[PDB]
C-alpha cells in the first residue's frame, strides 16, 4: 500500500476544506453555550450564532432556551473575528484560575474556553460536553484558518479519506502500482501530432 | 507526440497512481478515473475522462492499464459470468451517487441516518468485492443480487431516488422498452418492496420478533442446536442422560432422546 | 377450474371447436352472475391457449369485447373495475407477444371495439385513489402497441365530423387531465417517460388528423386548436434540464433512452403553428402567452426555433394591422413575460438571443418592424431590469434590498405606464410593509394606487379591478374603500394629520355624491378622535442618519 498511501495522504486538502466547511456550518447553526456558575437563576444556556457571513457572533445572555439558537439580535451580535488572539483551554482560562464565587469545579476542566479579545475582555464559556467543545475550538480555529483540535475531526478526516481512496481503487482492480512510479515512455521531441488535436 | 487513432476498445481508461501533470491536458488522475480515450498512441492515450467527458488527456501506456472491454461486458465477453457484470458497473455509479449524498449528509444533521447509510455502504462495498470473484455458487449469486438490490433500493428510498426494475440480470432488461404492463407491474413490485422495507424499519430496527415471524413464515423445517458443556451432578456411577424436547402442555416429548453417557468420575464417560 | 384444463384438453383436441364451445358456454351466463368470477375464469382462459391466436383470438375476443363493453357504462361498473382492468392488462400483454402470432388486424379490431369505451371510462373513471393507474397503464400499453395507420384506419374515419370533433375534444381534455395532475408517485420515473412518449405519439397522430380534416379543409370549426395548443404547452411544461440533471447520467440516461422529446414537441408545435396560416390572427390573443414560457425553456435549440415565432405572430398582426398594430399582442406579451420572468424562469443569454433574433428579423421587414425594434429594445431593458431584480433578491434576501429593487421596477413601470403590473408591484410593497408594519409607508404606497382613481362612479378600467375581489366596484366606491383602509393605517400609523386631510375629501365625496350620512357620522367621529389624539398624546422623534456609499 506504499504508493497507495503516498497518493492518499498526498491528496489531502479536499477533505480538509470539506471538514472545515462543515465546521463553519456547525458554528453558524450553533447552539446555546454555557456561562460561568449560572446557578442562582442565571441563563446558563444562551445561543451563539455565527453569521452566514462568518464575521459576527450572535452571542450574549439569552434565556434558558431548550430550542437552542433563535435567529434574532443577541446581546452582543459581534465578536470581532479578525482580532481574536486565541482561545485558552483548561487551566489557561483565567476563569478556571478563579477561586472565588466564579470558581469552576474540576468537572468542567475540558469545557473551559475563553475567547481572547480587547486584551482585557475574555469569553469564559462552557461547552455542554467535550466533543462540541473541540468542535467549537475547531470552528474558531477555522476562523483562524489553522489545524483542527477535535479528536472527532481527525476521526472524520481519516475515515472519509479511507472510503474515498477505497472507492478510488475500483478502476485499478487486479493491478499493482510500482512503488517507483512507472517510467514515463519517452515523448518524441516533435509535438506535430499526426492526428489532429481535440 | 504524433499518430493518434480513433478506437473504442479503451473505454476503461485506467490510471495507475495520481498522474503527473506532464501534458497540458492531464492532472493527478484519480485511481478511479475511468476515462474515455478518443485518440490512441502506442505508449500514450488521450481522450475524454469521467471527470470531464468533454476534455482530453494524453496518458502513458505504462500508466494506462489497457482494458479492451467497453461498457458492454458481453460484446467482448468480458463477463466473469454473463448478466452480472452490468450490475457491478451500475452499483459503482450508484456508489458515486452515495458519495455525493454522503457529502450532502455530513454537512447536515442527518448523522443518524447518515451513519446507517455508512454501514449499509460498507456492507455494499464488501459484497461488491466478494462478488467481484465468480467463485460463488449460482444460488448465492441470486441471493447477493436480491439482497444488494433491496439495500440499494432502500438507499434510494430514504433518499427519495427514482426506482429501478428488472430484479434480475442487471435491472435493465425491463427498462429496455420491452413491454408496458409488464413494465407497470415491475414498477408495482418495486413499490411493493418499498412498502416492505418502509414498514420493516419499524419492525426490525425497534422490534426483535416481527423479523423472526416473517422469517419463520417462509420455511417450514427448523432445528435446535444444543451445545452441552459439562454435567453438574454427584452420582459416582455411570449416568445415561436422555435429553430431548418435551411438550409439558401435552405431557409428551417432541424430539427423540439424545443419549449421553455420563461417567462415574464427574466427567462424561 | 374449467380453464384449468384448457391447455392439455386442447393438446388433445381441436383448437377452434373447444374455443367456440367455451365461448358459447360463457355467453350463456346471464348478465348478473358471478361477474368478477367469470372475469377470473376468462382471464385464466386468455392466459393459456392464447399463445396461439389465429384460430381463436379472432373468435375468442369477440365475446370478451362484448362483455367488456357491457362493463363499459351500465352504472354497475363499480365492482368489476379492477377485474376488467386485470383482464385488459393480461390480454394486451398477450397481444404484445410477438411469437404468439400476427394480430395487427386484431389490434385494430381491439381499438374499434374498446377504444372509445376506455376513453369514456378514464374520463369518468377519474379518481386517483382507486386503480385508475391500472386503467391508464392498460390504455397507454394500447397506444404503444398501436399504429399510425391503425389510428387513421377508423379512428380518423368515424361518422359525422361533429362526432369525431367531440370525441377528440374529450381525448384532449383527458390528456390534459392526466399530464396535469399526474397519476404516479414521480418515483416511477421510467414509466413516466414511457407515458410521455406514448402521449407524444398519440398527440402527433391527432395533430395530423386535425390537419387533414380540420385545416381550411374544414374552413370552419377551428376552435379546438385552443385545447390542442394548451395541452401541448402543458405537456411541454415539465421534465426539463434540472429534472434531467439530478444524477449526472440522468441527462445521459434520458437522452440515450429518450433523447430530447421536448425538442420534438417544440418543432411539432412550430410547424403546426406555421400551418395555422390565415386563422393565426383569428387565434393570436389567446395563444400569446402560451408560447413564451415554452420559449423560456432552459435549453438552447427549440428556443432558437421558438423566438422567431414571435416575429411570425407580430407579422400576422401586421397583416391585420390595417387597423392599428399589435398593441393587443404586445400587451399580453409584456404582461406574461413579466409573470414568467419574475417567476424565476429565464436567463441572460435568453434576452441576448431575443434581442439579436428580433432585430435580425426586423431588418428584413419595414417601418412596423422598426417600431418593433424600439419595442423589443424596451423589452430587453425590461428583461435586464427583472434579471437584476431577481439576482439581487437571491443575493441579499434582506427585505430592504427587495424593497429597493421593487421600487426601482415600479419607477421603471411608471416610466412604462403599464399601470397594471405597476399596481401589482405596488401591492407587493404593501404586503411587505404590512410585514414590517410600515403603516406610514404602506399607506403611502396604497395611496399612490388610490391616486390613479377618480371620484367618477364609472369603473372606467378593470385594470385596477384587482384580484382581491373582482366585480363591478364603481370607481368612486373602490376609491372609497382604499381611503378607508389608508385612514385605518394612518390612525394606527400614529400619524393623524394625513388622516384628517384625507377624511376631509372623503366626507366631501359622501355629502356631494353618495349622501351616506351614517358614513359621515362615522367619519367625523374618527376625525374628532384623531384631533383629540393630536392635541393629547405625544410621539417620539425619529433620528435621521446619512449614509455615504463608496
UniProtKB/Swiss-Prot annotation, chain A:
Quaternary state and interactors: Interacts with ADGRB1. Interacts directly with the SH3-domain of DOCK1 via its SH3-binding site. Part of a complex with DOCK1 and RAC1. Part of a complex with DOCK1 and CRK isoform CRK-II. Interacts with PLEKHG6. Interacts with HCK (via SH3 domain). Interacts with ADGRB3. Interacts with DOCK5.
Role summary: Involved in cytoskeletal rearrangements required for phagocytosis of apoptotic cells and cell motility. Acts in association with DOCK1 and CRK. Was initially proposed to be required in complex with DOCK1 to activate Rac Rho small GTPases. May enhance the guanine nucleotide exchange factor (GEF) activity of DOCK1.
Modifications after synthesis and translation: Phosphorylated by HCK.
Domain of life according to the entry: Eukaryota
Parent-record interval covered: 530 to 727 of 727
Domain PH: 26-147
Motif (SH3-binding): 178-185
Annotated localization: Cytoplasm; Cell membrane
Species of provenance: Homo sapiens
Designated name of the protein: Engulfment and cell motility protein 1
Residues with Phosphotyrosine modification: 191
Organs and tissues of expression: Widely expressed, with a higher expression in the spleen and placenta.
Swiss-Prot record, chain C:
Intracellular or extracellular location(s): Cytoplasm; Cell membrane; Cell projection, Podosome
Source species, domain of life: Eukaryota
Function summary: Guanine nucleotide exchange factor (GEF) for Rho and Rac. GEF proteins activate small GTPases by exchanging bound GDP for free GTP. Along with DOCK1, mediates CRK/CRKL regulation of epithelial and endothelial cell spreading and migration on type IV collagen.
Domains: entry comment: The DOCKER domain may mediate some GEF activity.
Subunit structure, interactors included: Interacts with CRK and CRKL. Interacts (via N-terminus) with tensin TNS3 (via N-terminus); the interaction increases DOCK5 guanine nucleotide exchange activity towards Rac. Interacts with ELMO1.
Family: Belongs to the DOCK family.
Protein name per the record: Dedicator of cytokinesis protein 5
Organism: Homo sapiens (Human)
The encoding gene: DOCK5
Amino acid at each position: 500500500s506504499r504508493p497507495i498511501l503516498e497518493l492518499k495522504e498526498k491528496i489531502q486538502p479536499e477533505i480538509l476544506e470539506l471538514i472545515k466547511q462543515q465546521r463553519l456550518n456547525r458554528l453558524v447553526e450553533g447552539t446555546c453555550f454555557r456561562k460561568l456558575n449560572a446557578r442562582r437563576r442565571q441563563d446558563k444556556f444562551w445561543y451563539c450564532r455565527l453569521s452566514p457571513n462568518h464575521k459576527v457572533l450572535h452571542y450574549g445572555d439569552l434565556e434558558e432556551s431548550p430550542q437552542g439558537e433563535v435567529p434574532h439580535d443577541s446581546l452582543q451580535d459581534k465578536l470581532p473575528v479578525a482580532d481574536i488572539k486565541a482561545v485558552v483551554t483548561g487551566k489557561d482560562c483565567p476563569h478556571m484560575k478563579e477561586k472565588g464565587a466564579l470558581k469552576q469545579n474540576k468537572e468542567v476542566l475540558e469545557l473551559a474556553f475563553s475567547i481572547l479579545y480587547d486584551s482585557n475582555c475574555q469569553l469564559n464559556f462552557i461547552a455542554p460536553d467535550k466533543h462540541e467543545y473541540c468542535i467549537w475550538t475547531d470552528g474558531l480555529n477555522a476562523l483562524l484558518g489553522k489545524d483542527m483540535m477535535s479528536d472527532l475531526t481527525r476521526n472524520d478526516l481519516d475515515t472519509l479519506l479511507s472510503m474515498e481512496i477505497k472507492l478510488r481503487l475500483l478502476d485499478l482492480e487486479n493491478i499493482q502500482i510500482p512503488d517507483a512510479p512507472p517510467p514515463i515512455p519517452k515523448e518524441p521531441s516533435n509535438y506535430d501530432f499526426v492526428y489532429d488535436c481535440n | 507526440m504524433a499518430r493518434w487513432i480513433p478506437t473504442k476498445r479503451q473505454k476503461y481508461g485506467v490510471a495507475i497512481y495520481n498522474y503527473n501533470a506532464s501534458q497540458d491536458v492531464e492532472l493527478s488522475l484519480q485511481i478511479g478515473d475511468t476515462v474515455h480515450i478518443l485518440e490512441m498512441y502506442e505508449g500514450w492515450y488521450r481522450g475524454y475522462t469521467l471527470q470531464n467527458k468533454s476534455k482530453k488527456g494524453i496518458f502513458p501506456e505504462t500508466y494506462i492499464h489497457l482494458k479492451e472491454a467497453t461498457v458492454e461486458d458481453l460484446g467482448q465477453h468480458e463477463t466473469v459470468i454473463p448478466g452480472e457484470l452490468p450490475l457491478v458497473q451500475e452499483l459503482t455509479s450508484t456508489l458515486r451517487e452515495w458519495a455525493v449524498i454522503w457529502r450532502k449528509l455530513y454537512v447536515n444533521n442527518k448523522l443518524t441516518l447518515f451513519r446507517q447509510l455508512q454501514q449499509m455502504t460498507y456492507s455494499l462495498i464488501e459484497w461488491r468485492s466478494q462478488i467481484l470473484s465468480g467463485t460463488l455458487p449460482k444460488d448465492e449469486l441470486a441471493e447477493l443480487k436480491k439482497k444488494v438490490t433491496a439495500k440499494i433500493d432502500h438507499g434510494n428510498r430514504m433518499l427519495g431516488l427514482d426506482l429501478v426494475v428488472r430484479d434480475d440480470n442487471g435491472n435493465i432488461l425491463d427498462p429496455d422498452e420491452t413491454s408496458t404492463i409488464a413494465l407497470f407491474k415491475a414498477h408495482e413490485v418495486a413499490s411493493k418492496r418499498i412498502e416492505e422495507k418502509i414498514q420493516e424499519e419499524k419492525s426490525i430496527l425497534q422490534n426483535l420478533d416481527l423479523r423472526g415471524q416473517s422469517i419463520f413464515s417462509t420455511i417450514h423445517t427448523y432445528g435446535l442446536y444444543v451445545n452441552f458443556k459439562n454435567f453438574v451432578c454427584n452420582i459416582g456411577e455411570d449416568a445415561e442422560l436422555f435429553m430431548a424436547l418435551y411438550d409439558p402442555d401435552q405431557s409428551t416429548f417432541i424430539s427423540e432422546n439424545y443419549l449421553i453417557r455420563w461417567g462415574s468420575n464427574g466427567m462424561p464417560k | 377450474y374449467l380453464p384449468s384444463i384448457i391447455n392439455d384438453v386442447k393438446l388433445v383436441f381441436d383448437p377452434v371447436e373447444l374455443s367456440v364451445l367455451f365461448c358459447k358456454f360463457i355467453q350463456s351466463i346471464p348478465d348478473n352472475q358471478l361477474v368478477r368470477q367469470k372475469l377470473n375464469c376468462m382471464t385464466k382462459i386468455v392466459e393459456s391457449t392464447l399463445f396461439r391466436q389465429s384460430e381463436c383470438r379472432e373468435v375468442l375476443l369477440p365475446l370478451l369485447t362484448d362483455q367488456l363493453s357491457g362493463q363499459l357504462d351500465d352504472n354497475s361498473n363499480k365492482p368489476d373495475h379492477e377485474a376488467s382492468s386485470q383482464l385488459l392488462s393480461n390480454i394486451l400483454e398477450v397481444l404484445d407477444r410477438k411469437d404468439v402470432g400476427a394480430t395487427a388486424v386484431h389490434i385494430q379490431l381491439i381499438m374499434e371495439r374498446l377504444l372509445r369505451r376506455i376513453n369514456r371510462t378514464v374520463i369518468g373513471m377519474n379518481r386517483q385513489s382507486p386503480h385508475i393507474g391500472s386503467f391508464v397503464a392498460c390504455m397507454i400499453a394500447l397506444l404503444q402497441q398501436m399504429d399510425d395507420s391503425h389510428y387513421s384506419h377508423y379512428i380518423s374515419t368515424f361518422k359525422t365530423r361533429q362526432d369525431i370533433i367531440d370525441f377528440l375534444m374529450e381525448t384532449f381534455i383527458m390528456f390534459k387531465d392526466l399530464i396535469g395532475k399526474n397519476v404516479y408517485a414521480k418515483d416511477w420515473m421510467v414509466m413516466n417517460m414511457t407515458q410521455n412518449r406514448v402521449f407524444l405519439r398519440a398527440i402527433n397522430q391527432f395533430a395530423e388528423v386535425l390537419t387533414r380534416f380540420f385545416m381550411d379543409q374544414a374552413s370552419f370549426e377551428l376552435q379546438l386548436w385552443n385545447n390542442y395548443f394548451h395541452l401541448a404547452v402543458a405537456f411541454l411544461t415539465h421534465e426539463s434540464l434540472q429534472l434531467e440533471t439530478f444524477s449526472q447520467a440522468k441527462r445521459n440516461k434520458i437522452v440515450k433512452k429518450y433523447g430530447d422529446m421536448r425538442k420534438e414537441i417544440g418543432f411539432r408545435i412550430r410547424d403546426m403553428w406555421y400551418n395555422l396560416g390565415p386563422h393565426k390572427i383569428k387565434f393570436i390573443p389567446s395563444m400569446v402567452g402560451p408560447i413564451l414560457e415554452v420559449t423560456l425553456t432552459p435549453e438552447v435549440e427549440l428556443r432558437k426555433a421558438t423566438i422567431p415565432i414571435f416575429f411570425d405572430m407580430m407579422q400576422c398582426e401586421f397583416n391585420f394591422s390595417g387597423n392599428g398594430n399589435f398593441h393587443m399582442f404586445e400587451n399580453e406579451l409584456i404582461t406574461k413575460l413579466d409573470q414568467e420572468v419574475e417567476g424565476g424562469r429565464g436567463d441572460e443569454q435568453y434576452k441576448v438571443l431575443l434581442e439579436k433574433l428580433l432585430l435580425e428579423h426586423c431588418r428584413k421587414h419595414k417601418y412596423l418592424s422598426s417600431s418593433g425594434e424600439v419595442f423589443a429594445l424596451l423589452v430587453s431593458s425590461l428583461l435586464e431590469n427583472l434579471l437584476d431584480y431577481r439576482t439581487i433578491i437571491m443575493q441579499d434576501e434582506s427585505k430592504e434590498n427587495r424593497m429597493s429593487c421593487t421600487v426601482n421596477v415600479l419607477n421603471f413601470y411608471k416610466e412604462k405606464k403599464r399601470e397594471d403590473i405597476y399596481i401589482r408591484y405596488l401591492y407587493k410593497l404593501r404586503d411587505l410593509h404590512r410585514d414590517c408594519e410600515n403603516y406610514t409607508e404602506a399607506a403611502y404606497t396604497l395611496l399612490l394606487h388610490a391616486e390613479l382613481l377618480q371620484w367618477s362612479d364609472k369603473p372606467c378600467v378593470p385594470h385596477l379591478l384587482q384580484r382581491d375581489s373582482y366585480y363591478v366596484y364603481t370607481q368612486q366606491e373602490l376609491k372609497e374603500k382604499l381611503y378607508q383602509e389608508i385612514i385605518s393605517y394612518f390612525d394606527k400609523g400614529k400619524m393623524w394629520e394625513k388622516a384628517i386631510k384625507l377624511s376631509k375629501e372623503l366626507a366631501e365625496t359622501y355629502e356631494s355624491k353618495v349622501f351616506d350620512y351614517e358614513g359621515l357620522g362615522n367619519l367625523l367621529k374618527k376625525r374628532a378622535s384623531f384631533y383629540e389624539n393630536i392635541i393629547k398624546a405625544m410621539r417620539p422623534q425619529p433620528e435621521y442618519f446619512a449614509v455615504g456609499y463608496y
